Amino acid sequence: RVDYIVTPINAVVSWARQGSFWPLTFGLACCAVEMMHATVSRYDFDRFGVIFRATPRQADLILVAGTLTNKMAPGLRRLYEQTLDPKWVLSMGSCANGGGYYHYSYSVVRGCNRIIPVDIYVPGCPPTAEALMFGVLQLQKSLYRQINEGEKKYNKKDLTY
Template structure:
């Protein structure tokens, strides 16, 4: 009797697996998210998506050093970055652009990495000022991090000590051009 129940249970399981297998259902097409992503990359929809991305760059406000003052000034009403779709945000979960504005100390680097990891993809980084690009006057200091571009994937470098708000606006425009001209349109998204 027990063997008969096991055989019956096995037959029922096989029957259910046959009915549930979507590959064998006639008239039903199954797909994966990768197949959908590959399809969208080949259509004009991806161009529309990238147009939206380039026209809504929300940058995270975390001023560091004297470049931070210029970054804050850029987000104020005088420069009206809203007309470009560039809006300052306070949360890494709402921002898609990180601006490293000034020197990065060894003590602050783990927090900066954590903020970068909390940002949703797609995300970009702008290195603003000589301190973030090459160390500036703190070059080879015991407490500052050198070569930030080896730690983070920097998209745009803005030189100056400190760069003016107009230079930051030009950096954002260059980032918008980079997003619009991207050929792979979807890598790391």
């Protein structure tokens, strides 16, 4: 009978976390430049509530937008670990996805998914600001739906147990 309360509060919590998705001000390369372009007037992330916070403690989203090197992989892992829960990960660009242009390099991790778990991938090089906004909006929709995906079954009285 506790499901009567949590499910509306589940919806409220999901709406609150999707309406204040704060990503970490952490960019690396041309992908970071396009990420900055995805914040300014033309494509306003503030419309969906996406405002950048400078510290991982105050950030819900880790936006890995750039090339991850072997000299940086421990840094990215530490940044992911120090981010307060719940947290999601968006890999923007071919370098973050699977290495991209530098996949055959001696000092490239060949994807940030080898270091930290990635929740969503945006493929472009660089992804357009529209592509990044699409990825962010899809991630917000998914994390809104992730609190209750129907895992709990329904008994004879249609209340999840």
